[PDB]
C-alpha cells in the first residue's frame, strides 16, 4: 500500500489505517457486552482463559477505574491496562482540582481524548483496545460510554465490544433494559455472553461480571458469587 | 515530538526541489500586482470568488502589518495569514526596540528570514507563498516581493500568481518612473483585467494603497469608482 | 594587603610586586610570584581575595596562549586588557565574582609600552604609571613627584627602589623583597629582586 | 507626580503634570506622562518612570497587534486586563501606577492600574504624589456627565491643586481629551509658572575659559 | 507484504498485530527453560542454566528482587537485568514509604505499566524477557508471568522459555496435586516439570540446576551447585 | 519517521558527502563573482542575475555585503542562505571586537564562519548551507587579503579567484594574466572587467550588469566603497580601447 | 552610592543648530585619584555622541555593549542611526538590566543625519528617556550643574557662546565635587565639524 | 473591608461594603467587592485587592470552561473548591480571604469560607475582612434558623452597617446581592438606607 | 505533471510537483468518509445550523450522539467529518474562547475564533509528523456590531464568511442549491432561515425529514444565547413546511 505506515498518513479516500488496523484488534478479543438499565449499568465480559495453568482470576477485563466507575476492555490488554490507568489518574485529577467525584461524560471525553491523541501522530501507534465506561449517581442516573482506538465517545444503553460484538447486540436489542433493574440484567448479560461465545473455537472461558448501581450505593463493584453463580446457572440452561 | 532533519535538500544538480514545488504553488496562485509610483506603492490582487455564499466582506487578502506597511500574496492563503503575523509581530518588536516604525526593507529582510527558517529547518515544508511588500519612509515607496525560498528583490513593478509572466511583460509596457499613484491604481486594474475572465466587481478584487499618509485598503465604495469606464 | 607597582617608560614598562603570601598573621611563603606570563611580552600582575587571583589569572592565560595556538600572532597588550577587563566585568554580576586588582604590562611592537590599571569591578585604565595595594597609597605620591615620561630604565629602578623604601620606611605590613621585571622588546627580563 | 482622569458625559479627560523629578531637584521641566496606548486609549503614568515608559509602550505593542489582528477598535478593557495581569504576574515590582482611560463602541472607562496589578473602575480617578490635592478638587467638584469644558476645567484645576500643593507635581498641565468622535491631546494646557526673568546679563565672551588643547575635526 | 509492517512497534498489520512484539515473545521463546510453581505456603522457581562452553559456568537465571519477591528470567539478560533493577527499586520505594513489602501484584501491574511504554512509542522495543516472578505476602503466594507483549498472567504454576510445552503439559497434568504438597514435593515437581523440557539423553545435575524459595516464614533464598543436592536426590528416573 | 529521513550528513560510499557537493553544483550553477589581491587593495567583481527586469536598486549592492568596518564580502549561490551567513559574519565580526576592542582580523572570521557551514555538514540532520563566498579585507597582521569558502566550510588565501558561473576559465586566465606582486589597484581592475568580459558568453558586456567593489586604506582607516556605473562604464571603455588595440 | 563610587560629571547643551557635549576627565577609585584621563564621552556616529557618567566599569561596558548594537544596527540597517533611535536603543540596553542595572546615567548629545536637528537627552540607570531643549546633566555633580545651566543657558546660541556656557558650567560645577574633575573635556557637534577642546581645570 | 454571605432556604444572601484603603487613606470608596464568579455563584472578597482580583479572575475562567465542558451549572462546592486550590497552593504568595457564596440546582444556597491560608468550609453563615471582628458577637446572638430572604437581607445589612461603623478599613455603601434559583438581585445600600444606629450620649 | 508526483508528497504534508499538498486534499476526502452533512444559513437577526443525525443502531444514545456543540454561550458549532478529530477541535475551539475571554476581558469573536481554529490548522499542514485534522467546523454566533455570523474552518486552514454554507458528503449539492436560494433573496426571518436550511439538507438528501432524525442550532439577535432546538420544536417546523 504505502499509505498504512504511520496514523499520520490517509490514504487517498482519506483513512487513517493504522486506526483501521487497531480496531481490527479490537475485533480479535472476545466480547464484553454492558448494559445501561433503569438503576445502574451491568458489565460482563467473555473471559477466555487460555491455559487452565492460570488463576481464576487472571487478567481480568473489568476495571474500577474509579470508585463509580468501572471499566469492561476489548482488545491488546496491556494497552487496556494503559488506558485503565489514564483513566484513574483522570479522576483522580478530577477530584483533586475540583473537588467532587467526575461525571462518567467527562472521564469518557477526556480519556477519548487521550486516545485520539494517538490517532495523530508517527511518533505513536493508536490503542488497540475499545472500552466501556459504565457509572451511576443519584443525579446523573445510569450511564454507559465507550470509546474506540479512533476516540469515538458515545453513550449507550446497550454496547458491545469484541469479535462477537454483532451477535451481542443483536441479542441486547431484544431487551427492554429501560424498565429493567440489575438484578434482571445480569442474568440478561450472562445469557448474552453464553450465547454469543463460540464453542467449537477457544474453549473453556470464565464469565466475568460486574455492576454499578442502586444496589451499590453508587460505587462499582464485581458481582457476588452467589449472584454471579445463579447468572451462570440460569445462562447454562438458557442455553440449552 | 517533531521532525529534526531537513525535507527540502539538494538534488544532484544543485536544486531545492522543494523551494521549486512552492513556487509552483506560487505560480498557481490568485494574480497579485504590485507597482510602485513616484509618491505611493498600489498593491492590487485578485479575489478568486466563485460561489457567492461567500461573505466577500470577511477576508482580506490585502493586508496592514503597520500604518506604513502592507502585505499581499499569491499562493496558499493560511501560509500568508502565518506570514502575516509573524510580520505584525516582526514589525512590533522593532517599535519595541527603537520606538520608530520598521523601515520596509528591514521588514522584508526580517520575514524572507523567517521564510529562510522554513527552508532549512526540521520537518517543514517551505511557505507555499510570495509576497508583495510595501512601505513608505523617508519619503520614498518600497515595493518587495519576498520569494519562498526566502529571498527578496526590490521592484519598480511586479506582478505574480497565475498568468504572471505575461502579467510581467504587460507591466514591462505599461510602467515609466513618473507616473503617479492613481496611474498606479489605474495600470494595476489593467494589469489584472489582463488575466482576469469573469467580470471584474467591486468585490472580486482588492487594492490597498501605500503613501505618506500610511497604509491603507481601498473601500469597495472607492475601488468601484476605479472601475469605472473600466 | 598585597602590593602591585607598574612604571612605563618610553620603550619598556617596570614592574614590581611584594613577594608575600600570607595567612592573617604568618608570612606563609616569603618567596611568592604575583605575576603572570600571558604572552612573551605580556604581564598580568594580580592581587585580591585568595583563589580568585590565581583562577581568574590562569584561566586569563590558557585564554592568550590558546588565542596564540589558534592563530599563529599573540594578542596585543591592549587587546589582552580589553579580553581581561571584559572576563572580569562579564563575571562581576554572575554568581561567581572574582575579586581581583589587576597590573596588565605589555610592550607591544607598534604601540610601545603599555601599563594598564584594573580594579575589582574591571574598570580598565592605561596609565604611566599605577599601584595596588594600601602600599599605593603612600608610593604613587612618589611616583607623581619624581616620573618624568622620558624616563631611562636605570632611573625607573632608582624611583622603584624610592617606592619600596618608602614602604619599608612607613607601611605597616613587612613586605622584605620584591619581585622586580622589566618588558620591553626583547620580552620579559627578571631584574634583580630588591629585598631589604 | 499628579495624574488624574474623570469621565464626563461624552468622554475621557486626563490631566498630568510635567515636573520630573530626580530626588528633590527637578530634572525635567516638561515631561510627559499621558501615553499613547491606542487611537482610543491613553494612560496616564506616575511611579518607577522608565517602568510606566516600557510597560505602556508594550501593551500599545500588544494592542497594536491585537486590533490589526481583530480588524476592530480596541477596548479599554482588554488594555486593562493586559495591564493588571503582566503587573500582576511581576508581583509589583514594576511601579506602573496607571490612569487608564479610553472610549470605545461600548463608551467611556476609566481604570487606575496599581503596581500591584489591582484595578479600579472608576468615573474619576487620581494617582502620583499629589494625588489627595487632586482628590481634594474632584471630591468637591464632581458631578456626574459634565460637559466636555466643564470637565477639562475641572481636571486641570485637579491637576493644578496637585502642582501647587505637592512638591513633587509642577510646571505645567497636560490634558487628554478623549471622545466618540474626537481625541485632543493637549500639551501644554495650562501654563501656570513661568520662569522668573533675568536682571543681570552675563554673556560669556571668547577668551574666559581657558583652553589648554584644542581640536578641529571637520566633516563632510 | 509483510516486510514494512515488521521493523517498527508503531505499525500494526492488516491483522491488528505488532511484528516487533511477537518478535521480541520469540526471544522469550529461545531462552533456557524455567518452572514456576506454587503451592498454599510457598512459590518456587526452578530454572534450567545453560552454560555458552563447559569451561564456562552457567548464566544465572534466578535473581533477588526483595526479601519476599524472586523472579527467574528467560530471553534477553540485559533487559532482564534492567527490568530486575526496576523492580528491586520499586520494592526498595515500598519499604521506605510504607515500611511493609509491596504486594506482588502491585509490583507486577507495576512492571506491565513500564513494558507497555515502550510497546507504543517510535523507535523504542519491548523488553525483551519473559518473567516468573515468584512473591509470598498477605495474599499467600504468587506465580506470575511477564510477557515482551506487556501482559501479566497470574499463574497456578506457569513454565517459560524453549521446549517449555513438555513442562506446560506436566504442570497442567499435576497441578491439582500442588496446593496440598509440602516444599520438598513442591520443588520435586518443579524438577520434574523443568526436567521435562530436557533432550532424551540429558539429566538434571547440581551444575545446571537453580532453585529460588519464598515461603510463609521464608525469605527468598535462591539454592546453587551445593545446596540443590538435598532437593535433587530423590529422585525418580524419567 | 526514519522513512523520510533525509540523510544529509552521511559519507557515501566513495566517501563523499552528497549534499555538500550538490550545493557546490549549484554554487557552480550561480552568478559568477571574482576577486583580486593588489599592493594597494583588493577587489570584488559580481555578475548581477537579477539583472535586467523592473527592478528597483534599493540597496549599495545587490551582492555586495559589507562585514564590519575593515571587511566586506560576496556570495554565490543560495540568497536567502547568504543572507543569513552575512548576518552571522556581522555578529562574530561585532562579538569579536566586543571581547578584544579591535577589529576581527580576517582568517578569524573566515574560520568561524566556516565552523558553522562544517557543523551543518557534520551534524545536525540540515541541509548544508549552498553558498560560496569570496572574503576582502585589511588587517594589522597579514594586510590586504582575499578568501574563499564554500558549503564544505573550507576556505584559502587567494591572489586571484572567482566562485560562480563560468569559475574554472575564470581561474585559467587569472592563472595566465595575473603577475605575483606586481599588481596595482587600476590593473586589477583592467583583470577583472577582462575576465568577467570573457567569462560572459550572453549579452554585450554592459556596465548596469557587474558590481564591482575596492578595498583600499586612506589614513589609517579602511574604505570599502562599491565602484559607479560611471566609473565601470570609462573601464570597460578602457578594457575596448585595449582590445582595439591588439591591431 | 554605587554611582559616585568613580565619580563623574557629564553634562549636554543645546544650541543654535548645534549641541555641546562635556565630561570631566577623572578616573578614581573613591578618594584616591588613578588616571586623569579617562574616557566617560564616546562618539556614536559622525553627529551623535553619547557621554556616560557613574560607575566606570559600566561606563566602559554600557559604552561596548552599546556600540556593539549600534554596528549591528547600522551594517544591517545601511545608515546611520538617528539620536531618537540611539536614545530608544540606549533606554532598551538599560531596562535589560532593570532588577540587575548598569550604575550609569548616560546623555545623549547629537545632530540628526538628515536635517542636522539637535537632539539632546539624558537617561537613568533604568533607561527613563529624558528629551530636553536645554540641557541635560549626569553625575555626581548634578545640583551644581543644574544651578550653572540654569543660570546661563540662553536659548539659540551660536557654538562660540555654546562652549563658553557649557565650559563655565563644567568648570564651576565641578569645583564642588570632590570625585569629579580632574581635567574637562568639550566636544561641539556642528554640521560641518566637531571641535574637541580640553579646558584648563583644576587638579586637586 | 468587611463582607458577608447569609444562607436562606432557596438561595444566599451575599454582602459586602465599599472601602479600599491604601493605609488611612480611602482609594476607593464605592468598590464593588462582590465578584459575579458564574451566574448564580458570587464571591466576596477581602484582603489583598490584587490578589483577590488575581484569583476571582483566574476561577472564573476555569470555573467558566469546567461549565462548558460539563454543559452543567456550576457548583458552588466547585467553586470554592477552585478558590480553595489557588489560594492553598500560593498561600504564602497571596493575602486573600475569600466568601464564596451562590446557588446551585444540586445542593441549593451554598456560603463557603475559604479564608487566608486556604482552608474551606460549609458555614450557614461566613463573615470576614477587617471589619468582621466587630460583629462576630452580632452575628452570633442575632443569626436565626430558618430566615426569608428578607430576613437575611436584613441580618447582612445591619451586621455590614455595624462593622462599617466600628471599622476604619470599613464604610463607604452596603453592596447587597440575593442569589437564587431565579437569578441575582443586587442592591446598593446608601445615606439613610444604610441601618443607623445611635450613639451613647451622656444624658 | 496532470496531478503528478515526486518523492514523499503522497505521504506526508510537503508539495507535489504541481504545487499541491496531497494529505490536505486526502483529509478533505477524510471529511466526507464519516457520511453526514451539515447545513448553516446565516439570516438577517439570526443563524441556524442544521445536520444529519444518523442513529442506525439503536442502542446508542441518541441525546449523546451529536454534532452541535456550544462553544461559548453565544458561540455554537456544527462538526462534519472525523468524529473524534471533530470532538478535539471543540476542545481546542473552548479553550481558545474561554484563553481570549480571561486574556482581554471580552467575548471571542466567531471571526477570531475561526481564524485562531483555522491558524491552528495551518500547523498540521506544515509540519510532517502530523496529518491534517479530517474535520469541518462551522462556528454560528451574534457579533455585537455585525450581528450574525457563520463561519467555516477547513483541514486546510482556509476560513470565510459564510452568507450560507454546508460541509459534507452533499457540500456541492447544497452549494448549488443556496446559490439557487440565495441569489434571488436572502429568505429571511427566523421562520426563514430556519426552513431555507431544512429544505436544502431535506432537498439534497431527499428524506423527508422526521424530526428524529435531524438536530438545530440556533443564535438570534435577541436571544444571543446559542440554543439548541427540541424534537417538539423542529416538529413544528416540520409541520410548517409540510403543509407548504
Not at chain 7, 44 to 66: K, N
Not at chain 7, 177 to 189: L, N, P, W
Request: charged content about 25%; overall charge neutral.
Amino acid at each position: 500500500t504505502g499509505y498504512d505506515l504511520s496514523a499520520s498518513t490517509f490514504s487517498p479516500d482519506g483513512r487513517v489505517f493504522q486506526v483501521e488496523y487497531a480496531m481490527k484488534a479490537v475485533e480479535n478479543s472476545s466480547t464484553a457486552i454492558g448494559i445501561r438499565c433503569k438503576d445502574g449499568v451491568v458489565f460482563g465480559v467473555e473471559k477466555l482463559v487460555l491455559s487452565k495453568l492460570y488463576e481464576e482470576g487472571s487478567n481480568k477485563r473489568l476495571f474500577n477505574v474509579d470508585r463509580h466507575v468501572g471499566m469492561a476492555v476489548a482488545g491488546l490488554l496491556a494497552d487496556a491496562r494503559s488506558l485503565a490507568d489514564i483513566a484513574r489518574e483522570e479522576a483522580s485529577n478530577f477530584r483533586s482540582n475540583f473537588g467532587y467525584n467526575i461525571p462518567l461524560k467527562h472521564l469518557a471525553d477526556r480519556v477519548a481524548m487521550y486516545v485520539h491523541a494517538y490517532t495523530l501522530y508517527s511518533a505513536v501507534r493508536p490503542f488497540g483496545c475499545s472500552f466501556m465506561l459504565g457509572s451511576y449517581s443519584v443525579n446523573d442516573g445510569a450511564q454507559l460510554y465507550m470509546i474506540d482506538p479512533s476516540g469515538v465517545s458515545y453513550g449507550y444503553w446497550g454496547c458491545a465490544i469484541g469479535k462477537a460484538r454483532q451477535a451481542a447486540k443483536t441479542e441486547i436489542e431484544k431487551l427492554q433494559m429501560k424498565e429493567m433493574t440489575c438484578r434482571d440484567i445480569v442474568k440478561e448479560v450472562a445469557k448474552i455472553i453464553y450465547i454469543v461465545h463460540d464453542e467449537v473455537k477457544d474453549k473453556a472461558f470464565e464469565l466475568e461480571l460486574s455492576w454499578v448501581g442502586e444496589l451499590t450505593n453508587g460505587r462499582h463493584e464485581i458481582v457476588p458469587k452467589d449472584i454471579r453463580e445463579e447468572a451462570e446457572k440460569y445462562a447454562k440452561e438458557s442455553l440449552k | 515530538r517533531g521532525y529534526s532533519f531537513s525535507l527540502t535538500t539538494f538534488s544532484p544538480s544543485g536544486k531545492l526541489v522543494q523551494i521549486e514545488y512552492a513556487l509552483a504553488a506560487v505560480a498557481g496562485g490568485a494574480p497579485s500586482v504590485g507597482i510602485k509610483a513616484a509618491n505611493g506603492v498600489v498593491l492590487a490582487t485578485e479575489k478568486k470568488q466563485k460561489s457567492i455564499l461567500y461573505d466577500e466582506r470577511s477576508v482580506h487578502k490585502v493586508e496592514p502589518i503597520t500604518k506604513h506597511i502592507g502585505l499581499v500574496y499569491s499562493g496558499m492563503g493560511p501560509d500568508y495569514r502565518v506570514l502575516v503575523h509573524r510580520a505584525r509581530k516582526l514589525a512590533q518588536q522593532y517599535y519595541l526596540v527603537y520606538q520608530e516604525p520598521i523601515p520596509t526593507a528591514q521588514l522584508v529582510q526580517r520575514v524572507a528570514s523567517v521564510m529562510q527558517e522554513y527552508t532549512q529547518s526540521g520537518g517543514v515544508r517551505p511557505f507555499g507563498v510570495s509576497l508583495l511588500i510595501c512601505g513608505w519612509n523617508e519619503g520614498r515607496p518600497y515595493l518587495f516581493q519576498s520569494d519562498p525560498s526566502g529571498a527578496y528583490f526590490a521592484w519598480k513593478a511586479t506582478a505574480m500568481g497565475k498568468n504572471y509572466v505575461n502579467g510581467k511583460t504587460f507591466l514591462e509596457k505599461r510602467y515609466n518612473e513618473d507616473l503617479e499613484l492613481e496611474d498606479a491604481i489605474h495600470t494595476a486594474i489593467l494589469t489584472l483585467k489582463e488575466s482576469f475572465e469573469g467580470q471584474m466587481t467591486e468585490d472580486n478584487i482588492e487594492v490597498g494603497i501605500c503613501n505618506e499618509a500610511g497604509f491603507r485598503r481601498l473601500t469597495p465604495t472607492e475601488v468601484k469608482d476605479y472601475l469605472a469606464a473600466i | 594587603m598585597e602590593y602591585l607597582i607598574g612604571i612605563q617608560g618610553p620603550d619598556y614598562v617596570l614592574v614590581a610586586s611584594d613577594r608575600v603570601a600570607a595567612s592573617n598573621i604568618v608570612q606563609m611563603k616569603d618567596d611568592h610570584d604575583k605575576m603572570f606570563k600571558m604572552s612573551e611580552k605580556i604581564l598580568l600582575l594580580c592581587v585580591g581575595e585568595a583563589g580568585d587571583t590565581v583562577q581568574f589569572a590562569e584561566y586569563i592565560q590558557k585564554n592568550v596562549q590558546l588565542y596564540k595556538m589558534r592563530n599563529g600572532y599573540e594578542l596585543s597588550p591592549t587587546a589582552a586588557a580589553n579580553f581581561t577587563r571584559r572576563n572580569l566585568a562579564d563575571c562581576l554580576r554572575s554568581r561567581t565574582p572574582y575579586h581581583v586588582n589587576l597590573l596588565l604590562a605589555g610592550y607591544d611592537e607598534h604601540e610601545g609600552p603599555a601599563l594598564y590599571y584594573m580594579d575589582y569591578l574591571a574598570a580598565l585604565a592605561k596609565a604611566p604609571f599605577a599601584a595596588h595595594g594600601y602600599g599605593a597609597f603612600l608610593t604613587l605620591s612618589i611616583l607623581d613627584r619624581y616620573y618624568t615620561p622620558t624616563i631611562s630604565r636605570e632611573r625607573a629602578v632608582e624611583l622603584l627602589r624610592k617606592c619600596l623604601e618608602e614602604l619599608q620606611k612607613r607601611f605597616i605590613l613587612n613586605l622584605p623583597t620584591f619581585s622586580v621585571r622589566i618588558i620591553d622588546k626583547n620580552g620579559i627580563h627578571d631584574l634583580d629582586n630588591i629585598s631589604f | 507626580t499628579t495624574i488624574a482622569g474623570v469621565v464626563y458625559k461624552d468622554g475621557i479627560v486626563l490631566g498630568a503634570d510635567t515636573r520630573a523629578t530626580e530626588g528633590m531637584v527637578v530634572a525635567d521641566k516638561n515631561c510627559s506622562k499621558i501615553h499613547f496606548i491606542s487611537p482610543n486609549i491613553y494612560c496616564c503614568g506616575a511611579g518607577t518612570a522608565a517602568d510606566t515608559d516600557m510597560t505602556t509602550q508594550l501593551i500599545s505593542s500588544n494592542l497594536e497587534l491585537h486590533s490589526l489582528s481583530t480588524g476592530r477598535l480596541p477596548r479599554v478593557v482588554t488594555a486593562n486586563r493586559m495591564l493588571k495581569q503582566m503587573l500582576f504576574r511581576y508581583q509589583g515590582y514594576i511601579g506602573a501606577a496607571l490612569v487608564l482611560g479610553g472610549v470605545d463602541v461600548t463608551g467611556p472607562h476609566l481604570y487606575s492600574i496599581y503596581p500591584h496589578g489591582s484595578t479600579d473602575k472608576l468615573p474619576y480617578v487620581t494617582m502620583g504624589s499629589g494625588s489627595l490635592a487632586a482628590m481634594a478638587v474632584f471630591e468637591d467638584k464632581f458631578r456626574p456627565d459634565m460637559e466636555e469644558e466643564e470637565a477639562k476645567n475641572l481636571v486641570s484645576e485637579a491637576i493644578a491643586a496637585g502642582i501647587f500643593n505637592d512638591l513633587g507635581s509642577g510646571s505645567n498641565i497636560d490634558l487628554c481629551v478623549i471622545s466618540k468622535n474626537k481625541l485632543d491631546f493637549l500639551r501644554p494646557y495650562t501654563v501656570p509658572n513661568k520662569k522668573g526673568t533675568r536682571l543681570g546679563r552675563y554673556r560669556c565672551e571668547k577668551g574666559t575659559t581657558a583652553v589648554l588643547t584644542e581640536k578641529i575635526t571637520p566633516l563632510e | 507484504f509483510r516486510n514494512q509492517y515488521d521493523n517498527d512497534v508503531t505499525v500494526w498489520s492488516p491483522q491488528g498485530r505488532i511484528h516487533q512484539i511477537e518478535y521480541a515473545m520469540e526471544a522469550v521463546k529461545q531462552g533456557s527453560a524455567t518452572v514456576g510453581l506454587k503451592s498454599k505456603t510457598h512459590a518456587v522457581l526452578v530454572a534450567l542454566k545453560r552454560a555458552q562452553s563447559e569451561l564456562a559456568a552457567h548464566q544465572k537465571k534466578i535473581l533477588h528482587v526483595d526479601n519476599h519477591i524472586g523472579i527467574s528470567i528467560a530471553g534477553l539478560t540485559a533487559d532482564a537485568r534492567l527490568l530486575c533493577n526496576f523492580m528491586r527499586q520499586e520494592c526498595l520505594d515500598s519499604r521506605f514509604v510504607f515500611d511493609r513489602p509491596l504486594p506482588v501484584s502491585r509490583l507486577v501491574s507495576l512492571i506491565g505499566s513500564k513494558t507497555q511504554i515502550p510497546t507504543q512509542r517510535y523507535g523504542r522495543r519491548p523488553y525483551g524477557v519473559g518473567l516468573l516472578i515468584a512473591g509470598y505476602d498477605d495474599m499467600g503466594p504468587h506465580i506470575f508471568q511477564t510477557c515482551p507483549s506487556a501482559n501479566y498472567f497470574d499463574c497456578r504454576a506457569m513454565s517459560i522459555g524453549a521446549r517449555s510445552q513438555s513442562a506446560r503439559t506436566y504442570l497442567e497434568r499435576h497441578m491439582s496435586e500442588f496446593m496440598e504438597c509440602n516444599l520438598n514435593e513442591l520443588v520435586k515437581h518443579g524438577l520434574r516439570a523443568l526436567r521435562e523440557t530436557l533432550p532424551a539423553e540429558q539429566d538434571l545435575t547440581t551444575k545446571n540446576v537453580s532453585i529460588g524459595i519464598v515461603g510463609k516464614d521464608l525469605e527468598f533464598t535462591i539454592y546453587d551447585d551445593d545446596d540443590v543436592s538435598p532437593f535433587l536426590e530423590g529422585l525418580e528416573e524419567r | 519517521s526514519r522513512r523520510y529521513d533525509s540523510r544529509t550528513t552521511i559519507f557515501s560510499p566513495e566517501g563523499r558527502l552528497y549534499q555538500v557537493e550538490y550545493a557546490m553544483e549549484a554554487i557552480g550553477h550561480a552568478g559568477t563573482c571574482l576577486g583580486i589581491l593588489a599592493n594597494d587593495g583588493v577587489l570584488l567583481a559580481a555578475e548581477r542575475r537579477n539583472i535586467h527586469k523592473l527592478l528597483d536598486e534599493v540597496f549599495f549592492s545587490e551582492k555586495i555585503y559589507k562585514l564590519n568596518e575593515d571587511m566586506a564580502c560576496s556570495v554565490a549561490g543560495i540568497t536567502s542562505d547568504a543572507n543569513v551567513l552575512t548576518n552571522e559574519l556581522r555578529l562574530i565580526a561585532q562579538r569579536y571586537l566586543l571581547q578584544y576592542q579591535e577589529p576581527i582580523p580576517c582568517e578569524q572570521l573566515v574560520t568561524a564562519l566556516c565552523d558553522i557551514k562544517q557543523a551543518y555538514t557534520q551534524f545536525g540532520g540540515k541541509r548544508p548551507f549552498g553558498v560560496s563566498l569570496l572574503y576582502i579585507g585589511w588587517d594589522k597582521h597579514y594586510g590586504f587579503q582575499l578568501y574563499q569558502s564554500d558549503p564544505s566550510g573550507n576556505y584559502g588565501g587567494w591572489k586571484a579567484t572567482c566562485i560562480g558561473n563560468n569559475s574554472a576559465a575564470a581561474v585559467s586566465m587569472l592563472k595566465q594574466d595575473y603577475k605575483e606582486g606586481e599588481m596595482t589597484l587600476k590593473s586589477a581592475l583592467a583583470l577583472a572587467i577582462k575576465v568577467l568580459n570573457k567569462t560572459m558568453d550572453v549579452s554585450k558586456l554592459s556596465a548596469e550588469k557587474v558590481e564591482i567593489a575596492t578595498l583600499t586604506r586612506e589614513n589609517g582607516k579602511t574604505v570599502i566603497r562599491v565602484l559607479k556605473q560611471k566609473e565601470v562604464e570609462q573601464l570597460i571603455k578602457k578594457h575596448e580601447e585595449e582590445e582595439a588595440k591588439a591591431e | 552610592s554605587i554611582m559616585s563610587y568613580n565619580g563623574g560629571a557629564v553634562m549636554a547643551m543645546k544650541g543654535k543648530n548645534c549641541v555641546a557635549i562635556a565630561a570631566d576627565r577623572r578616573f578614581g577609585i573613591q578618594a584616591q585619584m588613578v588616571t586623569t584621563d579617562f574616557q566617560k564621552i564616546f562618539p556614536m556616529g559622525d553627529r551623535l555622541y553619547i557621554g556616560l557618567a557613574g560607575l566606570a566599569t559600566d561606563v566602559q561596558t554600557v559604552a561596548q555593549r552599546l556600540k556593539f548594537r549600534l554596528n549591528l544596527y547600522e551594517l544591517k540597517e545601511g545608515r546611520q542611526i538617528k539620536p531618537y533611535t540611539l536614545m530608544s536603543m540606549v533606554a532598551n540596553l538599560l531596562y535589560e538590566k532593570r532588577f540587575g542595572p548598569y550604575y550609569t546615567e548616560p546623555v545623549i548629545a547629537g545632530l540628526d543625519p538628515k536635517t542636522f536637528k539637535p537632539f539632546i537627552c539624558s537617561l537613568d540607570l533604568i533607561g527613563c528617556p529624558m528629551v530636553t531643549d536645554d540641557f541635560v546633566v549626569s553625575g555626581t555633580c548634578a545640583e551644581q550643574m543644574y544651578g550653572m545651566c540654569e543660570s546661563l543657558w540662553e536659548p539659540n546660541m551660536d557654538p562660540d557662546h555654546l562652549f563658553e556656557t557649557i565650559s563655565q558650567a563644567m568648570l564651576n560645577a565641578v569645583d564642588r565635587d570632590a570625585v569629579s574633575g580632574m581635567g574637562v573635556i568639550v566636544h561641539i557637534i556642528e554640521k560641518d565639524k566637531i571641535t574637541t577642546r580640553t579646558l584648563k581645570a583644576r587638579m586637586d | 473591608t468587611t463582607i458577608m454571605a447569609v444562607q436562606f432556604d432557596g438561595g444566599v444572601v451575599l454582602g459586602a461594603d465599599s472601602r479600599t484603603t491604601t493605609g488611612s487613606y480611602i482609594a476607593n470608596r464605592v468598590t464593588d467587592k462582590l465578584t459575579p464568579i458564574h451566574d448564580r455563584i458570587f464571591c466576596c472578597r477581602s484582603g489583598s485587592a490584587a490578589d483577590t482580583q488575581a484569583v476571582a479572575d483566574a476561577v472564573t475562567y476555569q470555573l467558566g470552561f469546567h461549565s462548558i465542558e460539563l454543559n452543567e451549572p456550576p457548583l458552588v462546592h466547585t467553586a470554592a473548591s477552585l478558590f480553595k486550590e489557588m489560594c492553598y497552593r500560593y498561600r504564602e504568595d497571596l493575602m486573600a480571604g475569600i466568601i464564596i457564596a451562590g446557588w446551585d440546582p444540586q445542593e441549593g444556597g451554598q456560603v463557603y469560607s475559604v479564608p487566608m491560608g486556604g482552608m474551606m468550609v460549609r458555614q450557614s453563615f461566613a463573615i470576614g475582612g477587617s471589619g468582621s471582628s466587630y460583629i462576630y458577637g452580632y452575628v452570633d446572638a442575632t443569626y436565626r434558623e430558618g430566615m426569608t430572604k428578607e430576613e437575611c437581607l436584613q441580618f447582612t445589612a445591619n451586621a455590614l452597617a455595624l462593622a462599617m461603623e466600628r471599622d476604619g478599613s470599613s464604610g463607604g455603601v452596603i453592596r447587597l446581592a440575593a442569589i437564587a434559583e431565579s437569578g441575582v438581585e443586587r442592591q446598593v445600600l446608601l445615606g439613610d438606607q444604610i441601618p443607623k444606629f445611635a450613639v451613647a450620649t451622656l444624658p | 505533471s496532470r496531478g503528478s508526483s515526486a518523492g514523499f508528497d503522497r505521504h506526508i504534508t510537503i508539495f507535489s510537483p504541481e504545487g499541491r499538498l496531497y494529505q490536505v486534499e486526502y483529509a478533505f476526502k477524510a471529511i466526507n468518509q464519516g457520511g453526514l452533512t451539515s447545513v448553516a444559513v446565516r439570516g438577517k437577526d439570526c443563524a441556524v445550523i442544521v445536520t444529519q443525525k444518523k442513529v442506525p443502531d439503536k442502542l446508542l444514545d441518541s441525546s449523546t450522539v451529536t454534532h452541535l456543540f456550544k462553544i461559548t454561550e453565544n458561540i455554537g458549532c456544527v462538526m462534519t467529518g472525523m468524529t473524534a478529530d471533530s470532538r478535539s477541535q471543540v476542545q481546542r475551539a473552548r479553550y481558545e474562547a474561554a484563553n481570549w475571554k480571561y486574556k482581554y476581558g471580552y467575548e471571542i469573536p466567531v471571526d477570531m475564533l475561526c481564524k485562531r481554529i483555522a491558524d491552528i490548522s495551518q500547523v498540521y499542514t506544515q509540519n510532517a509528523e502530523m496529518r491534517p485534522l479530517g474535520c469541518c467546523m462551522i462556528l454560528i454566533g451574534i457579533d455585537e456590531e455585525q450581528g450574525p455570523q457563520v463561519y467555516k474552518c477547513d483541514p486546510a486552514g482556509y476560513y470565510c464568511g459564510f452568507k450560507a454554507t454546508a460541509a459534507g458528503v452533499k457540500q456541492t449539492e447544497s452549494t448549488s442549491f443556496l446559490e439557487k436560494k440565495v441569489k434571488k433573496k436572502f429568505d429571511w426571518t427566523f421562520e426563514q432561515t430556519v426552513e431555507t436550511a431544512i429544505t436544502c439538507l431535506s432537498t439534497v438528501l431527499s428524506i423527508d425529514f422526521k424530526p428524529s432524525e435531524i438536530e438545530v442550532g440556533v443564535v438570534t439577535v435577541e436571544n444571543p444565547k446559542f440554543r439548541i432546538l427540541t424534537e417538539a420544536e423542529i416538529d413544528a417546523h416540520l409541520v410548517a413546511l409540510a403543509e407548504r
